[PDB]
Amino acid sequence: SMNPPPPETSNPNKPKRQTNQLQYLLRVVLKTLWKHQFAWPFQQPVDAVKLNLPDYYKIIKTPMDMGTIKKRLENNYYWNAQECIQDFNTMFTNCYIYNKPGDDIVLMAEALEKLFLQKINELPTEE
Ligand SMILES: Cc1cccnc1-n1nc(-c2ccccc2)nc1-c1c[nH]c(=O)c(Cl)c1
């Protein structure tokens, strides 16, 4: 069983930009979520081999995690805030799709998502 290559975190062909909103996503949003008690399952790509979930990448064709998000923000990979928001929403959705409602990981994701939403409710207007 093999993992797919992880999502890219830089690309010379993709335009890059810093915006005040992306900075807020790194400094406030990601910072807050990263150190939460439930962040650890989401801090890196799902290692389907070592975790023994060999159907994970049969079901999840759009893998995303906060390690990837963090590196993309750090690298200025994103053009806008909406690209970054999308990656968080992809991560959460992947968890809900693969796992069964109720399950512990799902409750962890929900708590993380609640906090995410609270933080992006205060995204600044772009300068
Ligand atoms: C929470 C869980 C339950 C059952 C199987 N694997 C997991 N793990 N374990 C980890 C882990 C372990 C050590 C260091 C970093 C992450 N990550 C998961 C995991 C399982 N299923 C998922 O949908 C995600 Cl997003 C993470």
UniProtKB/Swiss-Prot annotation:
The NET domain mediates interaction with a number of chromatin proteins involved in transcription regulation (NSD3, JMJD6, CHD4, GLTSCR1 and ATAD5). The C-terminal (CTD) region mediates interaction and recruitment of CDK9 and CCNT1 subunits of the P-TEFb complex. It is also required for maintenance of higher-order chromatin structure. Belongs to the BET family. It is linked to Cornelia de Lange syndrome 6: A form of Cornelia de Lange syndrome, a clinically heterogeneous developmental disorder associated with malformations affecting multiple systems. It is characterized by facial dysmorphisms, abnormal hands and feet, growth delay, cognitive retardation, hirsutism, gastroesophageal dysfunction and cardiac, ophthalmologic and genitourinary anomalies. CDLS6 inheritance is autosomal dominant. A chromosomal aberration involving BRD4 is found in a rare, aggressive, and lethal carcinoma arising in midline organs of young people. Translocation t(15;19)(q14;p13) with NUTM1 which produces a BRD4-NUTM1 fusion protein. Residues 17-123 form the Bromo domain. Ubiquitously expressed. JQ1, a thieno-triazolo-1,4-diazepine derivative, and I-BET, a benzodiazepine derivative, have been tested on tumors with success. Treatment with GSK1210151A (I-BET151, a I-BET derivative) has strong effets on mixed lineage leukemia and promotes myeloid differentiation and leukemia stem-cell depletion. The record marks N99 as: Acetylated histone binding. It is found in: Nucleus; Chromosome. Signal peptide: none annotated. Changing N99A: Abolishes binding to acetylated histones. Interacts with p53/TP53; the interaction is direct. Interacts (via CTD region) with CDK9 and CCNT1, acting as an associated component of P-TEFb complex. Interacts with RELA (when acetylated at 'Lys-310'). Interacts (via NET domain) with NSD3, CHD4, BICRA and ATAD5. The interaction with BICRA bridges BRD4 to the GBAF complex. Interacts (via NET domain) with JMJD6 (via JmjC and N-terminal domains); the interaction is stronger in presence of ssRNA and recruits JMJD6 on distal enhancers. Interacts with NSD3. Interacts with NIPBL. Chromatin reader protein that recognizes and binds acetylated histones and plays a key role in transmission of epigenetic memory across cell divisions and transcription regulation. Remains associated with acetylated chromatin throughout the entire cell cycle and provides epigenetic memory for postmitotic G1 gene transcription by preserving acetylated chromatin status and maintaining high-order chromatin structure. During interphase, plays a key role in regulating the transcription of signal-inducible genes by associating with the P-TEFb complex and recruiting it to promoters. There is a cross-link at K58 (Glycyl lysine isopeptide (Lys-Gly) (interchain with G-Cter in SUMO2)). Disulfide bonds: none annotated. This is Bromodomain-containing protein 4. It comes from the Eukaryota. Phosphorylation by CK2 disrupt the intramolecular binding between the bromo domain 2 and the NPS region and promotes binding between the NPS and the BID regions, leading to activate the protein and promote binding to acetylated histones. In absence of phosphorylation, BRD4 does not localize to p53/TP53 target gene promoters, phosphorylation promoting recruitment to p53/TP53 target promoters.
